[PDB]
């Protein structure tokens, strides 16, 4: 059982680390997109008023 469950604990730890990296990268690129979006918006704006 020790050499049993321990395998499960380990593999599941690892998959958790994976998915967590993934969530992080997702939100970070969300930040980048919001930035680029607003800046394009304003560079479009200040040529019309």
């Amino acid at each position: 059982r020790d050499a049993a469950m321990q395998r499960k604990l380990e593999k599941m730890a690892d998959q958790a680390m994976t998915q967590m990296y993934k969530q992080a990268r997702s939100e970070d690129k969300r930040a980048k997109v919001t930035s680029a979006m607003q800046t394009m918006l304003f560079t479009m704006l200040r040529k019309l008023d």
């Binding site: 969300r30 919001t34 979006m37 607003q38 394009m40 918006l41 479009m44 704006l45 040529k47 019309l48 008023d49």
Partner: protein, 133 residues
């Protein structure tokens, strides 16, 4: 020559109808918003697809207006004016906003109001489709 600004057009539509199709036998209500169970939407979408080849092809399309993102002038499409479905107006519109979240940010970057409101006028002699910007 309809003055460029007149987008509404109703009593026209209804007047044409009352001079020509008078003795028709079910009510007609221009702006299809007022229609009931879709079938009334058909029976008025026709008459509009007819009365709309008499009005001018500029006053068709989005209806922009200027708002203020925290004291900053914008132009956004607050409605629409199809060739059939009469006039249609947004229902959750809101001027004077400070910081705008992801949702409305998105829904602003995809409206052509901002895009074409700031671009070089165009004129193309290769098609016939009414160019714009």
């Amino acid at each position: 020559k309809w003055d460029l600004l007149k987008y509404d057009f109703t009593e026209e539509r209804l007047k044409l109808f009352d001079r020509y199709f008078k003795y028709w036998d079910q009510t007609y209500h221009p702006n299809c918003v007022n229609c009931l169970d879709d079938r009334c939407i058909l029976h008025c979408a026709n008459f509009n697809v007819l009365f709309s080849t008499v009005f001018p092809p500029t006053s068709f399309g989005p209806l922009v207006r200027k708002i203020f993102v925290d004291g900053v002038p914008f132009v956004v499409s607050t409605g629409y004016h199809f060739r059939e479905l009469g006039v249609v107006h947004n229902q959750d519109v809101n001027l004077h906003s400070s910081r705008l979240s992801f949702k409305e940010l998105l829904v602003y970057a995809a409206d052509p109001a901002m895009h074409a409101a700031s671009g070089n006028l165009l004129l193309d002699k290769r098609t016939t489709c009414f160019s714009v910007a």
